[PDB]
Amino acid sequence: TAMTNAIKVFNFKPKHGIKLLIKEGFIPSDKPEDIARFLLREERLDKAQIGEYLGEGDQKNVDIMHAFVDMMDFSKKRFVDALREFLQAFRLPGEAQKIDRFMLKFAHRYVTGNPNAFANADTPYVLAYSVIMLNTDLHSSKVVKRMSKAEFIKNNRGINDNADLPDEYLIGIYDDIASNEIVL
Amino acid sequence: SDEVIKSVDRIFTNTANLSRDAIIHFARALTEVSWDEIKVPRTYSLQKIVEISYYNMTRVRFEWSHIWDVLGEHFNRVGCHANTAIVFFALDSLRQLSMRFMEIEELAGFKFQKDFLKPFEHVMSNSSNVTVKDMVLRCLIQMIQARGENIRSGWRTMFGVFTVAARESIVNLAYENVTQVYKTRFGVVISQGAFTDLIVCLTEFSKNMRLQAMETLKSVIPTMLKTPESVEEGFWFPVLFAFHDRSNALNYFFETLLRYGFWDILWRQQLYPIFTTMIQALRNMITLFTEYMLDRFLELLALCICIARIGSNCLQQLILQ
Numbered sequence A: 001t002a003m004t005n006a007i008k009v010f011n012f013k014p015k016h017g018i019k020l021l022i023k024e025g026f027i028p029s030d031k032p033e034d035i036a037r038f039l040l041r042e043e044r045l046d047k048a049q050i051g052e053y054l055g056e057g058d059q060k061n062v063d064i065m066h067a068f069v070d071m072m073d074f075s076k077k078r079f080v081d082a083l084r085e086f087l088q089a090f091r092l093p094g095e096a097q098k099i100d101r102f103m104l105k106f107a108h109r110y111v112t113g114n115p116n117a118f119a120n121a122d123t124p125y126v127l128a129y130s131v132i133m134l135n136t137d138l139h140s141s142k143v144v145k146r147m148s149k150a151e152f153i154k155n156n157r158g159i160n161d162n163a164d165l166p167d168e169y170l171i172g173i174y175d176d177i178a179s180n181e182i183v184l
Numbered sequence B: 001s002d003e004v005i006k007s008v009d010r011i012f013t014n015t016a017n018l019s020r021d022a023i024i025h026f027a028r029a030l031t032e033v034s035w036d037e038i039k040v041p042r043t044y045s046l047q048k049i050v051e052i053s054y055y056n057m058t059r060v061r062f063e064w065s066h067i068w069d070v071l072g073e074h075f076n077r078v079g080c081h082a083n084t085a086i087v088f089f090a091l092d093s094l095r096q097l098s099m100r101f102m103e104i105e106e107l108a109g110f111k112f113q114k115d116f117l118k119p120f121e122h123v124m125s126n127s128s129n130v131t132v133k134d135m136v137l138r139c140l141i142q143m144i145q146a147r148g149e150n151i152r153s154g155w156r157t158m159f160g161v162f163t164v165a166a167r168e169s170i171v172n173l174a175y176e177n178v179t180q181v182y183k184t185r186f187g188v189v190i191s192q193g194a195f196t197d198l199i200v201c202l203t204e205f206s207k208n209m210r211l212q213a214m215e216t217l218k219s220v221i222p223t224m225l226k227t228p229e230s231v232e233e234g235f236w237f238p239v240l241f242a243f244h245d246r247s248n249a250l251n252y253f254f255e256t257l258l259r260y261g262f263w264d265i266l267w268r269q270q271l272y273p274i275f276t277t278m279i280q281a282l283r284n285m286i287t288l289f290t291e292y293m294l295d296r297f298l299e300l301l302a303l304c305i306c307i308a309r310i311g312s313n314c315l316q317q318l319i320l321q
Helices: A006-010 A014-021 A032-041 A047-054 A059-071 A079-087 A096-113 A122-138 A149-155 A167-179 B002-017 B020-039 B044-055 B061-079 B084-102 B112-116 B118-126 B130-147 B155-164 B170-182 B186-191 B195-207 B212-220 B233-243 B247-257 B263-268 B278-287 B292-304 B308-320
Strands: none
Touching: A006 A014, A006 A047, A014 A047, A032 A059, A047 A059, A047 A096, A059 A096, A079 A096, A079 A122, A079 A167, A096 A122, A096 B061, A122 A149, A122 A167, A122 B061, A149 A167, B002 B044, B020 B044, B020 B061, B044 B061, B044 B084, B061 B084, B061 B112, B061 B118, B084 B112, B084 B118, B084 B130, B112 B118, B112 B155, B118 B130, B118 B155, B130 B155, B130 B170, B155 B170, B155 B195, B170 B186, B170 B195, B170 B212, B186 B195, B195 B212, B195 B233, B212 B247, B233 B247, B233 B263, B247 B278, B263 B292, B278 B292, B278 B308, B292 B308
16 A cells, blocks of 8 residues: 555656665665665566666675675576676666676676676677677668678687687677667 | 876776677787886886776676687796796786686686686696796785685686696695695585596695605505495506506505496496506406406406516416316
8 A cells, every 4th residue: 555656756766666665665784695685576667777886886785786686596597698688687787887887796706606607707798799799780770881601700710728618609689689679 | 197097097997898709809918018028128018907806797798709819828838938027027917807806706617717817727737937837826815815715616727737737846735735724624625626636636646756746645545435325437447557657656556446346437447457567467357356248348458468488477366266
């Protein structure tokens, strides 16, 4: 019979919305685990706003976004599909620092869930920037020049402990990018 | 001049706002001018490189790695320089910059600190000077004492420095510090996937001849295996690769063969000891029986040996046993 209007507070004021939301309803404790649980599980909250809040540089926010990234699972899943799942839970902000903070933990979670896919956790990170750049480039008609496969492979040369990734992996990633656009 | 100095300071203070393709060129230009200055002997350019490195700690991580791909190269060039004072200044400032770096909160599984500390390994493996290596060890150990708790994913190259400093004192100090680290932060070392590097460093101390060798012989297998209640197989691999490759460690390999007395992969490296003193090793190999699939290849190994006369005299006895 209440709490329905509590969601709308976060949609414009993130810190105010959270600091008002905790005292009633869900979230028994201010610990990052519970707030991440509610943030992923509950809809009707702005994806861009939660992306901005989780990507914030505050230590508590960064712990909460650790919890949120860990809560999703990418074990025994393709890198492209894992990235799509990662981006399908929130809308990433436009700040370079926030994207970096998100995508670092994305790569770390993918490695700790799907080991032996890449030699070091730096490789999924670099591949994640490369694939997001290719997604932005391919599905945008704002540029007449077209991004091809050979140029993409050349751009992704020696990104796995200065050793080239398998060509078929990149071909599959390119085909998945061409299939559809990663959308919020 | 007030305005000129303000402008020259703001040029470097504005480095954090440059784009990637621009900051890379800035780094390369500063590297080139710094090398030009060092070759002729001021270090103002080096000081500015250090200041830029301080200003770019907060930069996006992959852009920072690309920047370090040239800054660390310049630091390697400076470390190999023949001027003791300049190398000491560069290493001291790299120590300070590393203490600043470690607070970056690197996630486990990454390799940023490992790549950032690479210049120390390069200086250790590419400098011919006892005092330079001693300074590198001293700064690394000051790092251990000061910001050891934050060392995450940076232990790989930072034991690489120790295991490269296993050659001549330098070795005494290096072994003492490795022993302290192993006996104080073993959980941390194994947590960040540095177990293999720790084992390699210890077995490189052991493999090194010319007292400390005996101490690390007793501190590599005996005191380690008791602590963990690829940890075991990746332990026995370096034991093989260094113990049997003087006579004291050679035999101690054979007397440690029997301590433990998965099997397929362990057998794959079991050929190498066989294919001198290896007679005792082969006797221990048969004693290892303390299983059917082993018999497909153990007789093959036994017959492979048939110096030759005594080898076959051992062959007959071992086949009988």
